[PDB]
Amino acid sequence: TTEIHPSCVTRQKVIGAGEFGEVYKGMLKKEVPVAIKTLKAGYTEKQRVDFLGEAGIMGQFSHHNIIRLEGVISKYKPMMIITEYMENGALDKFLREKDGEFSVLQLVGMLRGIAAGMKYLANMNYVHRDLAARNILVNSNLVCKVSDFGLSGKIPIRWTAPEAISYRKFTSASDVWSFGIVMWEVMTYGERPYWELSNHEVMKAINDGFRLPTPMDCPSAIYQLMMQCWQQERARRPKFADIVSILDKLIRAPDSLKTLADFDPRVSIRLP
Numbered sequence: 001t002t003e004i005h006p007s008c009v010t011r012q013k014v015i016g017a018g019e020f021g022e023v024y025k026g027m028l029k030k031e032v033p034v035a036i037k038t039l040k041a042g043y044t045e046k047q048r049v050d051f052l053g054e055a056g057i058m059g060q061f062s063h064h065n066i067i068r069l070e071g072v073i074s075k076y077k078p079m080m081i082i083t084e085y086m087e088n089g090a091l092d093k094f095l096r097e098k099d100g101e102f103s104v105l106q107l108v109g110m111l112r113g114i115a116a117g118m119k120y121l122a123n124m125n126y127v128h129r130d131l132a133a134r135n136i137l138v139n140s141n142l143v144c145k146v147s148d149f150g151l152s153g154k155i156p157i158r159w160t161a162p163e164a165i166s167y168r169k170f171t172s173a174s175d176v177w178s179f180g181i182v183m184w185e186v187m188t189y190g191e192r193p194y195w196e197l198s199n200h201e202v203m204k205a206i207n208d209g210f211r212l213p214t215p216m217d218c219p220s221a222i223y224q225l226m227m228q229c230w231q232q233e234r235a236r237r238p239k240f241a242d243i244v245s246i247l248d249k250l251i252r253a254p255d256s257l258k259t260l261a262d263f264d265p266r267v268s269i270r271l272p
């Protein structure tokens with residue numbers, strides 16, 4: 001963590017909400033665009049511990065696929081966490097606003113980058129607990145950076161592994177389940193997992209053995225990989241090292257992605 005003087009920061013627009021403050025877009029001194037989370041007067045001891053703890057963990061991460069911390073303001077009030085800014089925004093909204101605009105290889109490359117960031121976090125003994133496309137930022141090189149904006153607080157049942165829902169067992173292996181959901185989010189351009197099923201219906205379907213069907217136009221290898229992320233038995237899921245290795249090999253032999261999984265049509269259209 002670098003300590004930044006408040007005279008170097010200008011808050012411009014509110015872009016979100018913090019636990020005890022606001023999240024802004026701004027400029028950091030030529031100027032550089034930044035995102036800024038503040039801790040406002042009246043914060044509790046616990047909030048200060050969590051806020052500066054968050055800053056400390058982010059300063060420890062140095063990876064291509066993890067959001068970069070520019071610095072912290074801790075010596076003056078209000079306190080601030082300052083990161084790089086991504087004009088393309090969060091991955092879920094990005095894909096939904098750009099439906100069908102990318103190649104299969106571009107989509108799989110986004111997944112490889114997300115997996116590499118997650119392998120790094122898991123190796124550093126950091127369990128994310130809220131991996132979803134809404135918590136991934138996209139830069140102007142299409143590079144995805146794992147982030148955590150806090151709960152949307154809506155609990156993300158349909159991204160969470162059964163053991164984490166059932167008995168609060170959050171590990172890198174429950175993050176692997178979440179990663180499989182993110183794979184499905186990417187390959188569908190941001191569709192809502194399980195569509196209109198309620199949270200209870202999703203849990204019931206998973207316990208009964210159902211799994212999300214293949215996205216349209218999805219490489220067979222990619223659907224196979226996401227399905228193995230959704231094994232009920234935690235020990236049977238791939239580790240992030242396995243996921244990175246597979247995605248890297250598929251990208252480097254790109255003909256491997258041309259074999260597509262069968263898509264199950266809901267609608268039959270008959271014509272001559």
Ligand SMILES: Cc1ccc(C(=O)Nc2cccc(C(F)(F)F)c2)cc1Nc1nc(-c2cncnc2)nc2c1cnn2C
Binds near residue numbers: 016035058067083089
């Ligand atoms: C200011 C800020 C503070 C904290 C984080 C954040 O990701 N923190 C965090 C906490 C725990 C673990 C991780 C980890 F592991 F990297 F994923 C990150 C990100 C940001 N940056 C951003 N937040 C937000 C943002 C938006 N809406 C609500 N909250 C934050 N939007 C951003 C950025 C950057 N660009 N954009 C478009």
